[PDB]
mmCIF file of C-alpha atoms in Angstrom:
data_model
loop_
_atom_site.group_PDB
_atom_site.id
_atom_site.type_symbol
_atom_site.label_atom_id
_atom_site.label_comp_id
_atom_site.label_asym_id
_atom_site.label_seq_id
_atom_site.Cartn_x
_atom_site.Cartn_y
_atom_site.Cartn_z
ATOM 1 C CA UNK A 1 20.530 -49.126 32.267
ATOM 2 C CA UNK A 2 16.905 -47.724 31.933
ATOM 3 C CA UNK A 3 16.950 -44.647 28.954
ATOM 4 C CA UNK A 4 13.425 -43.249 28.479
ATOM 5 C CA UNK A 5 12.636 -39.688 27.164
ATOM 6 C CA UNK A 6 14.803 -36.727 28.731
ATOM 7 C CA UNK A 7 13.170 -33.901 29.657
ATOM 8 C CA UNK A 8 14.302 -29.928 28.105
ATOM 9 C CA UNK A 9 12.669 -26.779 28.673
ATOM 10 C CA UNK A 10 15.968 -24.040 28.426
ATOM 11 C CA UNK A 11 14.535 -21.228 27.523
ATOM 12 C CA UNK A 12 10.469 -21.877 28.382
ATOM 13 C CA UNK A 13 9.788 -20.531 25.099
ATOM 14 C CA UNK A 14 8.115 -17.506 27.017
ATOM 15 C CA UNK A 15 4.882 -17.870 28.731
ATOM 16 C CA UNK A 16 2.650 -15.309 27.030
ATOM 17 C CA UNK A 17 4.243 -12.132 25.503
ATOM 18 C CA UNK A 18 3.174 -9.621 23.782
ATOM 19 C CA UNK A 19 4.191 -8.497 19.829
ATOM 20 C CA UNK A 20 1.576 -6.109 19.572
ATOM 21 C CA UNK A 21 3.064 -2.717 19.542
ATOM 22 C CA UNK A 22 2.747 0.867 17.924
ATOM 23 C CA UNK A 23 4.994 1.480 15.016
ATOM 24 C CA UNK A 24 5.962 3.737 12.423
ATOM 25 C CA UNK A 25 2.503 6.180 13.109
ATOM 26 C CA UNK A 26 2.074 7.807 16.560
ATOM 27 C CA UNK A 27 -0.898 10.066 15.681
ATOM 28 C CA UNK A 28 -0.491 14.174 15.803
ATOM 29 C CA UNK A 29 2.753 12.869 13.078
ATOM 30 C CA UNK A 30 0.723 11.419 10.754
ATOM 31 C CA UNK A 31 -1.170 14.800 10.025
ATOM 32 C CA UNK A 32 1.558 16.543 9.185
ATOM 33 C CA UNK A 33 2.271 14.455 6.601
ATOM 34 C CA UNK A 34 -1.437 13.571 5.695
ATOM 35 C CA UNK A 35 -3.144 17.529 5.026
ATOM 36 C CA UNK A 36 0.999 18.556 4.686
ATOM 37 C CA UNK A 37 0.691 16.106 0.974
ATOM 38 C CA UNK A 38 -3.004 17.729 0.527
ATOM 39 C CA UNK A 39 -1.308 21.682 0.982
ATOM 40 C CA UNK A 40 1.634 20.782 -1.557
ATOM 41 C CA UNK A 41 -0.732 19.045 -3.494
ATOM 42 C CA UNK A 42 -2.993 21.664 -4.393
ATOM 43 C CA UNK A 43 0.023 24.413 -5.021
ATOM 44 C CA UNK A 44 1.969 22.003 -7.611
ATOM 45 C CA UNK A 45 -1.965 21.523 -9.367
ATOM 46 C CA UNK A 46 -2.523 24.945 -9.360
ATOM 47 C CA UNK A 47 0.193 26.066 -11.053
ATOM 48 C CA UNK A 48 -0.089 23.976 -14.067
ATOM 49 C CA UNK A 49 -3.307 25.503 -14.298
ATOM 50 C CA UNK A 50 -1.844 28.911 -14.875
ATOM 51 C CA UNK A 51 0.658 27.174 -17.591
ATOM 52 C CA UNK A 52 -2.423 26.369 -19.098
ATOM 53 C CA UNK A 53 -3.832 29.804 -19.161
ATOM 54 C CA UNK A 54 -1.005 30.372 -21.286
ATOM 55 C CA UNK A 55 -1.608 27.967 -23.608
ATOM 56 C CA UNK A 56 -5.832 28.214 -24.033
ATOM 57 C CA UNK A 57 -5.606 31.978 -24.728
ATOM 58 C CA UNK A 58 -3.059 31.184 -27.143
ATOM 59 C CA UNK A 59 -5.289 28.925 -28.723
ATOM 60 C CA UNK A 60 -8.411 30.225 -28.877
ATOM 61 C CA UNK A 61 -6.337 33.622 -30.231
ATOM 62 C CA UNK A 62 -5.962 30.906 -33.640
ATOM 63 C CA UNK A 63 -9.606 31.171 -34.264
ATOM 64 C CA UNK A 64 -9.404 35.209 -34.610
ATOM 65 C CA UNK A 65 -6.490 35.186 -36.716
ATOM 66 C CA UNK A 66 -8.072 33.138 -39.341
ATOM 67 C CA UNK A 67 -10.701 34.934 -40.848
ATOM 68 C CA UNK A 68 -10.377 33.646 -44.441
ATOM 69 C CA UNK A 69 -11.527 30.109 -42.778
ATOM 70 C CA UNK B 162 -11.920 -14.274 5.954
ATOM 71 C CA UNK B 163 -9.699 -16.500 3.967
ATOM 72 C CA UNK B 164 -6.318 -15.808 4.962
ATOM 73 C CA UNK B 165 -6.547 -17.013 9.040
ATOM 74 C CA UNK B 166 -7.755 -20.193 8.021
ATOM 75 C CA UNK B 167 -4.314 -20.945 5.600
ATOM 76 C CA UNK B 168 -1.948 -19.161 7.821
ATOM 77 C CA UNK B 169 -2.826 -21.557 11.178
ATOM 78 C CA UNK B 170 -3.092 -25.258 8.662
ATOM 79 C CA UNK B 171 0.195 -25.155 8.261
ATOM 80 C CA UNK B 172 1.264 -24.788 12.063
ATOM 81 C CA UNK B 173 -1.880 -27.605 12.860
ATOM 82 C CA UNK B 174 -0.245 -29.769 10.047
ATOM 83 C CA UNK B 175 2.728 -29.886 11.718
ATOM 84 C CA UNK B 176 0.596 -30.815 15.194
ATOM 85 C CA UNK B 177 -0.418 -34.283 13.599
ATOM 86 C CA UNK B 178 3.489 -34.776 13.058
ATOM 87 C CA UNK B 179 3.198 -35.127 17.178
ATOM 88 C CA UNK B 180 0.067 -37.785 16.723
ATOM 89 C CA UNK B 181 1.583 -40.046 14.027
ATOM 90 C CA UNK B 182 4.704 -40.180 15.718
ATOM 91 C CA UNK B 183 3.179 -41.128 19.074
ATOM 92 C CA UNK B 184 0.227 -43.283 17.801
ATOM 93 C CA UNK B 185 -0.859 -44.586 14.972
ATOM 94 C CA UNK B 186 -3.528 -42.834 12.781
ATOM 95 C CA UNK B 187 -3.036 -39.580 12.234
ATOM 96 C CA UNK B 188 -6.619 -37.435 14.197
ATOM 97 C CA UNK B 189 -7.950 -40.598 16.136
ATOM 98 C CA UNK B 190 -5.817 -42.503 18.371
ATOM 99 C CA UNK B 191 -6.662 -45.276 21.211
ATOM 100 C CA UNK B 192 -3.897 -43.652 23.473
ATOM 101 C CA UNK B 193 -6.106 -42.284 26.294
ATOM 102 C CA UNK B 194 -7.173 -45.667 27.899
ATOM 103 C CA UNK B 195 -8.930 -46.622 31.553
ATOM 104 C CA UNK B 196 -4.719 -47.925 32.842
ATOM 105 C CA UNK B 197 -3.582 -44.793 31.711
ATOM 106 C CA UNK B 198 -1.546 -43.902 28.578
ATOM 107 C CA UNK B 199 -0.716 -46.747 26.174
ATOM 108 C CA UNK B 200 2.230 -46.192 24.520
ATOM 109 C CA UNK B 201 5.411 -44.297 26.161
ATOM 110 C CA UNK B 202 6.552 -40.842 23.819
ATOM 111 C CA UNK B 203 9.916 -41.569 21.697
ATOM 112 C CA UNK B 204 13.021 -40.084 21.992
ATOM 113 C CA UNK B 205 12.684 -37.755 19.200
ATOM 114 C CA UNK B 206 9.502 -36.139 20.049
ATOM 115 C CA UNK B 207 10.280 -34.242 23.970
ATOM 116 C CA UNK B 208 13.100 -32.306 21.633
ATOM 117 C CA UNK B 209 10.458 -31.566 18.788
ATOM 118 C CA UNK B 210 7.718 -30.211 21.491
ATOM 119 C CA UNK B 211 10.017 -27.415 22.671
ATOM 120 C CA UNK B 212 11.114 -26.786 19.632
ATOM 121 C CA UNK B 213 7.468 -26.262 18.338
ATOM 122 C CA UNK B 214 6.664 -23.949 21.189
ATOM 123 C CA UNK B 215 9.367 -21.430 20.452
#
């Protein structure tokens, strides 16, 4: 008996195919989200800015009460 | 770009797995000859080629 090397393809492995494909963004979505964190990041900013008011009137107000400094 | 270079070494390392096992050396082999091929493939390698394509 004559045994030499066997020949297996099975599957072919897949002659050229692609993996390439779009994922997660799709374009007009991405916006939203992109000027949509810019919109609701300027409002939450903002508003601490006001708290602050509250506290650098109240501070400077310090410097008028103390008059025997 | 230093990243491509690593990333495909490791899949050509395995190529000269298919060299040693079929000639001697491991780059350079006297395999290709004017009566045709010199030495026949083992038994072990026509599994490992498909297997390496997949």
């Amino acid at each position: 008996x004559x045994x030499x090397x066997x020949x297996x393809x099975x599957x072919x492995x897949x002659x050229x195919x692609x993996x390439x494909x779009x994922x997660x963004x799709x374009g007009y979505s991405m916006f939203a989200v992109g000027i949509g964190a810019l919109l609701f990041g300027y409002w939450s900013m903002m508003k601490w800015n006001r708290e602050r008011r509250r506290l650098q009137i109240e501070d400077f107000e310090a410097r008028i009460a103390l008059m025997p400094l | 770009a230093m990243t491509p270079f690593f990333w495909m070494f490791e899949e050509r390392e395995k190529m000269f797995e298919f060299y040693e096992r079929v000639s001697g050396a491991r780059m350079h082999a006297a395999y290709v000859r004017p009566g045709g091929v010199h030495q026949d493939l083992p038994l072990g390698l026509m599994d490992d080629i498909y297997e390496f394509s997949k």
